[model samples]
Target: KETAAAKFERQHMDSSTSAASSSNYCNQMMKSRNLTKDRCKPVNTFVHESLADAQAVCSQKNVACKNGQTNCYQSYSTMSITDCRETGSSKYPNCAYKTTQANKHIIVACEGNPYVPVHFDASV
Candidate 1:
């Protein structure tokens, strides 16, 4: 079963390495992460933290999700992350992005029996 929790990690986690400053970071990562398979993802963020670390956010501050969900939680501390925004001229099969790296608190929606992050809400 491919749960939303698993998909969240696939789309937003990057615990393997803590370094990625190239302009091509988005172009490469977005594709490598399988986000460019059918159509380019307009925006996404990669958190440079371990799975356990990210999961802990579910125990952090409670917040309202973008869609007015009350299950959202925000990280108590700032974490390293990279934001990928699609380029103005980007097109499918030729997806391009502009990368912006920053340290900020992440917000995610949690769910299920074990209570884990199932969606990447925002970074503030």
Candidate 2:
């Protein structure tokens, strides 16, 4: 089983990106991260901030999830992030995505012992 920390890194960490490197980031990241395995992840977000800063979202103000879960929290400050939106032509093993970078407060779902981010909810 993937540990929570592993999951976090897989879903959020991009040790290789920046605003300048994000134009094709989603196309590269989604495939490299294994999110493009069986099917494409329709929408996703990657925080271009430090692990500690990203973990802090659990203690930030809370908000309702799009599906109504209360475990979601919004970042207190604007964060550097990249959003990946799967294109209509996206197909398994050949997924395609558009990359967009923005400085925005992110909403994410938290989980487990240290209360780390486990889901990329939205950017608000």
Candidate 3:
């Protein structure tokens, strides 16, 4: 299994581009601020047969779900209900939605073996 930090780095790192090439992006922001790892911690995640199921779970938890959004779930608190949306696309495509809060952490449950929570750092 891959640690959240490792998975984050692997997904965000641009292998084909040089550090300089990514300087104008968040990679530079991270470097400049000395933020080397994922700041959000992983909490519990739940998986469902479809995006609707995921959102329903979140709703049951009482988290807000933005309209037209899909795929992931977010919680305002550990005990608070999580909001869920569908993940669009055939290949790791996520639903489109926005949140009122900044730097919110989400719990993602994907379909598959040994379902687990995946950390997703929200951007913009």
Could you tell me how far off, in angstroms, the CA of residue 66 lies in candidate 3 after the best superposition? 8.0
Clashes of each: 0, 0, 8
Q: Write the per-residue lDDT of candidate 1 for residues 50-112, one digit (tens) a residue.
A: 989999999999999999989999999999899999988899989999999999999999998
Model 1, poorest ten-residue lDDT window?
16-25
Give the distance in Å from residue 15's predicted Cα in candidate 1 to where it truly belongs: 0.5
Which numbered prediction scores highest in lDDT against the true structure? 1
Off by over 4 Å in 2: 20-22
Tens digit per residue, CA lDDT, model 2, 80-122: 8888988888787778898888899988889889788887788
Q: How high is the CA lDDT of each candidate model?
A: 0.93, 0.84, 0.30
Of the two candidates 2 and 3, the one with more favorable TM-score, higher being better, is 2
Give TM-scores for every candidate, taking all chains together and pairing residue i with residue i.
0.96, 0.86, 0.23
Candidate ranking under TM-score, highest first, comes to: 1, 2, 3
lDDT of 3 at 119: 36
Against the correct fold, how does model 2 do in TM-score?
A: 0.86
